[PDB]
Design an enzyme around this catalytic site. Structure first.
Site, mmCIF file in Angstrom:
data_model
loop_
_atom_site.group_PDB
_atom_site.id
_atom_site.type_symbol
_atom_site.label_atom_id
_atom_site.label_comp_id
_atom_site.label_asym_id
_atom_site.label_seq_id
_atom_site.Cartn_x
_atom_site.Cartn_y
_atom_site.Cartn_z
ATOM 1 N N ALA A 181 -8.969 -2.287 4.390
ATOM 2 C CA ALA A 181 -9.440 -1.239 3.394
ATOM 3 C C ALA A 181 -9.036 -0.101 4.220
ATOM 4 O O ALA A 181 -9.224 0.231 5.525
ATOM 5 C CB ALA A 181 -10.739 -1.260 2.956
ATOM 6 N N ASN A 184 -9.862 6.342 2.589
ATOM 7 C CA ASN A 184 -9.667 7.706 1.668
ATOM 8 C C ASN A 184 -10.923 7.319 0.467
ATOM 9 O O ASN A 184 -10.949 8.218 -0.224
ATOM 10 C CB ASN A 184 -8.543 8.100 1.321
ATOM 11 C CG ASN A 184 -7.441 7.031 0.678
ATOM 12 O OD1 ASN A 184 -8.026 5.685 0.734
ATOM 13 N ND2 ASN A 184 -6.640 7.394 -0.068
ATOM 14 N N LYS A 207 -11.915 -5.652 6.887
ATOM 15 C CA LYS A 207 -11.812 -5.085 8.151
ATOM 16 C C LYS A 207 -11.910 -3.376 7.603
ATOM 17 O O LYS A 207 -11.045 -3.106 6.776
ATOM 18 C CB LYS A 207 -10.572 -5.365 8.782
ATOM 19 C CG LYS A 207 -10.593 -4.247 10.218
ATOM 20 C CD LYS A 207 -9.305 -3.631 10.731
ATOM 21 C CE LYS A 207 -9.406 -2.322 11.190
ATOM 22 N NZ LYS A 207 -8.216 -1.359 10.905
ATOM 23 N N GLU A 210 -11.193 2.692 10.403
ATOM 24 C CA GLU A 210 -12.348 3.108 11.484
ATOM 25 C C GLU A 210 -13.096 4.083 11.063
ATOM 26 O O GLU A 210 -14.185 4.183 11.825
ATOM 27 C CB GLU A 210 -11.192 3.525 12.820
ATOM 28 C CG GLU A 210 -10.481 2.408 13.251
ATOM 29 C CD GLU A 210 -9.808 2.593 14.539
ATOM 30 O OE1 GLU A 210 -8.446 1.965 14.930
ATOM 31 O OE2 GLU A 210 -10.476 3.186 15.609
ATOM 32 N N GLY A 240 -8.265 0.097 16.482
ATOM 33 C CA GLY A 240 -6.803 -0.350 16.557
ATOM 34 C C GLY A 240 -6.497 -1.468 15.778
ATOM 35 O O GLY A 240 -7.002 -1.891 14.482
ATOM 36 N N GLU A 288 -0.734 -2.242 -0.807
ATOM 37 C CA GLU A 288 -0.494 -1.019 -1.756
ATOM 38 C C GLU A 288 -0.365 0.053 -0.542
ATOM 39 O O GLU A 288 -1.163 0.489 0.136
ATOM 40 C CB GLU A 288 -1.583 -0.578 -2.527
ATOM 41 C CG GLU A 288 -1.336 0.683 -3.439
ATOM 42 C CD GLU A 288 -2.136 1.910 -2.869
ATOM 43 O OE1 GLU A 288 -3.537 2.097 -3.370
ATOM 44 O OE2 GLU A 288 -1.548 2.819 -2.238
ATOM 45 N N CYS A 322 -3.616 8.528 -2.215
ATOM 46 C CA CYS A 322 -2.292 7.647 -2.761
ATOM 47 C C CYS A 322 -1.754 8.204 -3.865
ATOM 48 O O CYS A 322 -0.584 8.078 -4.160
ATOM 49 C CB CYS A 322 -2.543 6.312 -2.572
ATOM 50 S SG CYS A 322 -4.394 5.413 -2.807
ATOM 51 N N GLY A 477 -7.400 9.821 -9.860
ATOM 52 C CA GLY A 477 -8.596 9.542 -10.578
ATOM 53 C C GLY A 477 -8.469 8.452 -11.651
ATOM 54 O O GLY A 477 -9.085 8.431 -12.513
ATOM 55 N N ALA A 478 -7.595 7.408 -11.487
ATOM 56 C CA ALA A 478 -7.350 6.371 -12.526
ATOM 57 C C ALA A 478 -8.588 5.564 -12.475
ATOM 58 O O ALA A 478 -9.237 5.251 -11.657
ATOM 59 C CB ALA A 478 -6.150 5.456 -12.046
HETATM 60 O O1 LIG Z 1 -6.748 8.338 -6.850
HETATM 61 C C1 LIG Z 1 -6.847 7.559 -8.040
HETATM 62 O O2 LIG Z 1 -6.097 7.648 -8.636
HETATM 63 C C2 LIG Z 1 -7.499 6.024 -7.832
HETATM 64 C C3 LIG Z 1 -6.673 4.980 -7.089
HETATM 65 C C4 LIG Z 1 -7.318 3.829 -6.384
HETATM 66 C C5 LIG Z 1 -8.493 4.855 -5.705
HETATM 67 N N1 LIG Z 1 -8.639 6.036 -6.928
#
Ligand SMILES: O=C(O)[C@H]1CCCN1
Ligand SMILES: O=C(O)[C@H]1CCCN1
Ligand code: NA
Ligand code: NA
Lengths: 516, 516
Positions: A181, A184, A207, A210, A240, A288, A322, A477-478
């Site tokens: 994971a 962010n 995992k 860090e 690491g 991803e 992302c 923000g999906a």
């Molecule tokens: O920021 C975004 O669009 C969603 C995707 C997974 C984390 N939050």
């Protein structure tokens, strides 16, 4: 099992006095428990180690938020044996039972929302609302997947009948796998990447990133309390690559679920393609791997609507998404009126310690700050710096919101994912040119279009080659369930999170015929 | 579009005078055409080369059944070019149009049924019912997938609404990919692996197995006459690993569909996980890599019915099936009565020129005979040869139905896929041991149980770990629609053919939001 139809957990905006009051308390209590030690979690018990990891506050890195145990190969192997033993019986739980366990987990998480949001503010430097959105999203994954998992229950597959026989097709889980994971979304993406596989009968060794081990331990406090049986879920902070390479390359590791950088996601994908000595299956790997996402604005758009959405998508969580708008592709008649509005807005943004609820907090770490400061150096040679471009005063890792203009589409800072509050503005002639520029990167994660021309919107819909596309609104923000999340090209394998299809990735099918 | 509910294409048994006569007319037509040359099919046209491939009759290998063109790197590059240009417009056909093209192709294939059957008889040595099952299965894949594709049509994804927004999720095809087909089902599996991807808007480059290039070419005659746009399907017969190595490794091949040996599938999956220089995506590789499939019979079974099914399963198409019973696991009470009944039945099987409709024709090539005879030699060292075990007279690659008994579970002949008429019999104390022995292989494709004890059958449904389990009936002959076909463990990636879930492998998803 009957529950209410899925709704998204509302995102706290802290406008009411009861919200602020509740948050101020949450923050005080979390600050007052700085320095807490969290062990590993393996086979249903917290297991401690002689070595330790330190988690610091990016707003004030002299402060230790907490420390956790540190997992070696031995700890990874033990967890992997506990996950396999757990699987023998966990795969056999009625789906209804597994989904109820998820619902208990989500109700416990909800009851601890403010504390979770507060821990995100201190440990990874989110402002109040970003931390609330993260936690709401984590709750959403659990509620959604608990529901989705029942659509795969015994026997789910539609098949053509045959005279004199019973033909029954059904999904079974895969086994024990590993989750890697990101830092962010260390509540939300950490949670969903574990709970999706587990809901349908898999077992996971997780995992955490860090930078985000303490908030990952708090999610494990929730699993433990919810009552997952021993070894179903396992928690292995480490430093690491020892732990993750050991599990990723292991013959008895069944699948790998990764969210993170392209560099790691490529090594991971190539490693999963190999038969480790004595491995007896073809490993699945769901990766991803980020984006270089763009918002197009044409001269027909609402320019004040646009300028708002760009600032939100560029600068929400310091651009550390992302899904962040790192590119602003502006058509000829949009260029000046949009750019000046984005600059007037972006210059007004506060930057400060995340607890103060600034517009922007710090970047996550000294590593990230160096990486982002280094890309800003590169942008100074590739485009025209018109806003920011500098580290601000303070010991915490503060970086001014930065704009480059007149960026060549093929510049490093227009191709390479910076993951910091750095926007590149690219001028184009018309809307066709806008699409070529938008599509011309190695990535395909989010993308947005501001325009009122229907034909341009519907053209983007069919040709703007990104997995998550938004018109006349922010591109970050999906929401779980609403917008299936996941990308094209080197943004990853298109494993659509918060969608019913996600859980199919973690199941195989058996067809059983009885001739009577 | 509205068509009749899917039904499987009836397999001809040739019990009537008309059907035997219709078969002789088709065998005669086919052999009068042994002099034919079949080119490559690239970009909607037949394209010849200087080099050629020769196809021989396994029942009379001095007799040539036809010759084809031979593709190398350069025709592969050309087919790849043609396939990507096609994709640009073929992705945009309404699903209803693509599905009607498939239905058209199915009707051409049904009108040319006996010709294709007769081509399978002379080219790959199938008796008349095996050939008719193979062609009928190809027709089923075209009919099944034409219908299954439409369940995916715009906008298929179920999502949660959000106030003030339109949220639309939908599937788009991947791009241009390569199909590497086997010689043992060179009409059915060949057709399925190509038309599944194509139904939903992918384009395909097909490399047939060398042993079956003439029947592949005749399937392209169908594709051509049905009207697939230039570039959508391409046909590249080749020798050796040139063509498939080139394309599996290519930066611009999007996916790989493969059916063949584990050896080659392991390389392909390893290849597919690598980013070739300048590749902009994670390759999808779908592989079906064979089996070491067992029938368990316990002491409560119908012993005559078991021995019949075992013989069909073991010796159907000379045992050259991924689904073939190659292990027979008998409990103590079942051992003598079942072994004697199998020996009595296997000893009255005829072997000869496939066009005489023997129970067994030849194995497919000189090299297949080598392999089978070589395993027979190992087998002699590992258990008791008790029937067959020898080459029969004639230049044709005729081998006797062979049975070994007292085979240890971990002997090579009980572990490695031989792909010839060779059965290994394993004696065990009870059903528990029987199930351990069935599971203890690298593979997990097909399996079978004969028993009248419900608890043993329902135990097996749960714990006999094969993707296609059959009770009290043959284990070969999986029907499209009825039994989704694909395996576990080293039998491949559980890509279930003849199933709704198969097409999802050739799609990715996009989520498009408009805030009004
Ligand atoms: O920021 C975004 O669009 C969603 C995707 C997974 C984390 N939050
Ligand atoms: O023999 C069988 O089981 C089916 C699988 C694909 C070819 N025919
Ligand atoms: Na930290
Ligand atoms: Na041949």
């Amino acid at each position: 099992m009957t529950v209410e139809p899925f709704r998204n957990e509302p995102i706290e905006t802290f406008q009411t006095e009861e919200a602020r009051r509740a948050m101020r308390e949450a923050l005080r209590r979390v600050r007052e428990e700085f320095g807490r030690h969290y062990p590993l979690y393996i086979g249903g018990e917290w297991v401690d180690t002689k070595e330790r990891m330190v988690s610091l506050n990016p707003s004030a890195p002299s402060e230790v938020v907490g420390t956790t145990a540190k997992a070696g190969k031995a700890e990874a192997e033990a967890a992997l044996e506990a996950a396999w033993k757990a699987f023998k019986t966990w795969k056999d739980w009625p789906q209804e039972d597994r989904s109820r366990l998820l619902l208990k987990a989500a109700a416990l998480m909800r009851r601890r929302k403010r504390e979770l949001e507060a821990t995100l503010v201190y440990e990874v430097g989110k402002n109040w609302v970003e931390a609330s959105a993260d936690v709401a999203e984590a709750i959403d994954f659990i509620e959604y997947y608990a529901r989705a998992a029942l659509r795969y229950r015994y026997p789910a597959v539609e098949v053509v009948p045959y005279p004199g026989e019973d033909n029954e097709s059904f999904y079974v889980p895969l086994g024990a796998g590993v989750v890697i994971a990101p830092w962010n979304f260390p509540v939300a993406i950490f949670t969903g990447m574990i709970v999706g596989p587990v809901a349908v009968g898999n077992t996971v060794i997780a995992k955490p990133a860090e930078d985000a081990v303490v908030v990952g331990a708090k999610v494990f406090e929730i699993f433990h309390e919810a009552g997952f049986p021993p070894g179903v879920v396992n928690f292995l902070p480490g430093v690491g690559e020892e732990v993750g390479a050991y599990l990723v390359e292991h013959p008895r590791i069944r699948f790998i679920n990764f969210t993170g950088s392209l560099e790691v996601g490529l090594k991971i994908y190539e490693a999963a393609g190999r038969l480790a000595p004595g491995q007896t299956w073809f490993k699945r790997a769901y990766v991803e791997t980020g984006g270089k996402d763009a918002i197009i604005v044409d001269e027909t758009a609402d320019f004040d609507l646009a300028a708002e959405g760009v600032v939100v998508s560029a600068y929400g969580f310091q651009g550390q998404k992302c899904s962040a708008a790192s590119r602003l592709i502006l058509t000829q008649g949009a260029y000046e009126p949009v750019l000046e509005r984005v600059l007037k807005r972006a210059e007004r943004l506060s930057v400060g310690p995340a607890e103060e609820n600034p517009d922007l907090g710090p970047v996550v770490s000294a590593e990230q700050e160096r990486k982002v400061l280094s890309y800003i150096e590169i942008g100074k040679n590739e485009g025209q710096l018109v806003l920011g471009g500098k580290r601000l005063e303070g010991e915490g890792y503060f970086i001014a919101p930065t704009v480059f203009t007149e960026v060549p589409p093929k510049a490093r800072i227009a191709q390479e994912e910076i993951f910091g509050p750095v926007l590149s503005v690219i001028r184009v002639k018309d809307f066709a040119e806008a699409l070529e520029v938008a599509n011309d990167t190695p990535y395909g994660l989010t993308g947005g279009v501001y325009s009122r021309k229907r034909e341009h919107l519907e053209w983007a819909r069919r040709e703007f080659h990104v997995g998550n596309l938004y018109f006349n609104r922010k591109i970050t923000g999906a929401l779980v369930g609403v917008q299936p999340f996941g990308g094209f090209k080197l943004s990853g394998t298109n494993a659509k999170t918060g969608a019913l299809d996600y859980l199919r990735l973690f199941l195989e099918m058996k067809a059983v015929a009885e001739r009577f």
